[PDB]
């Protein structure tokens, strides 16, 4: 039941949900925030683009 | 069973629930306490807002 | 099983419960009244319109709404 | 399984349980203490009157 | 599965289980450790008592 | 699944399990570790005793 | 749903009594250590004798 | 369901006894036993000179 | 229900999910993967230069 | 679901799993075993010179 | 549902899953995040590696 907070630091950030071809994409624009939870459908989440990301394990910056 | 607190810092903030499911408009100063359902995998916030989660605070910045 | 504490700072604060789907169970609160609202299955989101002090597991926050 | 502690600071404090009409009211007199637990029947609890309230989220005072 | 500790500071303190009704008299210095059942949604304390809960201590006055 | 520790400070301390459904006498210096069952909603302590719970210590007089 | 007590006997003939009738007695000699867990069978545990007792709630000494 | 004790034998012939509802195991000086509580096993008695760690801190058994 | 955060410090970092070796996933410099353990996936191997966060602290994989 | 970390400080350290029954497992100097408790396995005995980490802190088994 | 983080400090580190069954080779600098399955009671690490567990860090000094 865990989640990640992703804040987009540029336009056209891509938050990709995975299972095994990559199955749910979600575009985010500069300053928008996504709170993404892990479903059963969704094993992994990839972030392409400049974003600030918070997880139970601390913060991290994607420099895609 | 976790939730997010969202306080709108301008009018017309948009709190979008993702499965193309559920939009919810918020006006400046209004507070939404949104919980994750089974229906709702992700929540997107478009607009200037202050957000609290289990993982600390964060600010969404509307263009 | 989590809850929010809402104290109304003016009369006519509105604590709106939202369904699993739009604006549903409304509940008016008057200046100084305190509501302890728990999330049900029926209730996915809670909106607060009006001047209120709110406590959640995630700390305090103040609603400055209409 | 969580609960609230309510101490009445005046007579005729009203502790109202909500399902959604005014299902269960409970009067409290100055100095009396109620330890109220959330049931399935009970989604929300309203406190009308001057009272000192303790929850998992800290203390708060209701002002009648 | 949570409980409250109640110590009576005078005689004839009343610990009421919750319209629903199990009453329990306590005398000065007696201690009750009351747990919440399914039967019991709320507990009222009438009388002067010292009360400990998960949420800290509190004193009932009369 | 929670429990209380009770140490008797005098003879003839009475540890009563409720819904007087089970009484249990304790003598000066004896220690009882009482757990809550489904059978047992409340526990009353009559007598001089030192009591430890999850919520800290307390003395019955 | 699964807690235990540590009991160290400070004299010979310490008695660790399991309750429900007075179900199960267990003698302890000076310096022996018993780690007793609560079963469904066992609601309460009585210690008679001089012993050092550790519980989740801290230490306590039984006196004779 | 699932807690354990660490027992280090400080002499030879330490006895770690498992007790049933209402199993002996010998330990020689310097051997370590990590014993978990089963359903079969309500209580554990230690006879002999040993160093014992539990969730509740350390304790020494004095044969 | 636990997860690892992997940030790629060079191009062509390989995040391999293990059953054999069943699921590979390439990551390019600066991309972030939040990988959760499934039932299908017992182990995860990281090949390449990466910064990794787990419940157990941080660690760097050295390509 | 708990586990012990055992690092062997000499050759031929013996990590014995108990229920009755005994799965033995030899460890050579500097090898590390992360042993989890199964239902099959009530107790674990360590014979030999080893460094042991458990939820309850560290402890050294003395050969 | 617990896991271990293993970083290989030399080539040819061996991460062995037990019930000598599932072996998994690791090369210098590669990282494995291994979870305990039902199939897998114990994990042995042979070779020079840095290991993180819920119980802190430890270094294997191996084959």
From Swiss-Prot, chain G:
UniProt-listed NCBIfam families: PRK13251.1 (NF009724)
UniProt entry tagged with the keyword Transcription: yes
Keyword set includes ATP-binding: no
Cited function: Required for transcription attenuation control in the Trp operon. This trans-acting factor seems to recognize a 10 bases nucleotide sequence in the Trp leader transcript causing transcription termination. Binds the leader RNA only in presence of L-tryptophan.
Quaternary structure and partners: Oligomer of 11 identical subunits arranged in doughnut-like structure.
Record-linked Pfam families: TrpBP
Protein known as: Transcription attenuation protein MtrB
InterPro entries in UniProt: MtrB (IPR000824), Trp_RNA-bd_attenuator-like_dom (IPR016031), Trp_RNA-bd_attenuator_dom (IPR023558)
UniProt entry keywords in alphabetical sequence: RNA-binding, Transcription, Transcription regulation
Family: Belongs to the MtrB family.
GO MF annotation: an example: identical protein binding
GO biological process, one term: DNA-templated transcription termination
């Amino acid at each position: 039941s865990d989640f990640v907070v992703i804040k987009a630091l540029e336009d056209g950030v891509n938050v990709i949900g995975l299972t095994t071809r990559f199955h749910h994409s979600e575009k985010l624009d500069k300053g928008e925030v996504l709170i993404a939870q892990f479903t059963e459908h969704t094993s992994a989440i990839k972030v392409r683009g400049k974003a600030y990301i918070q997880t139970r394990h601390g913060v991290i910056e994607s420099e895609g």
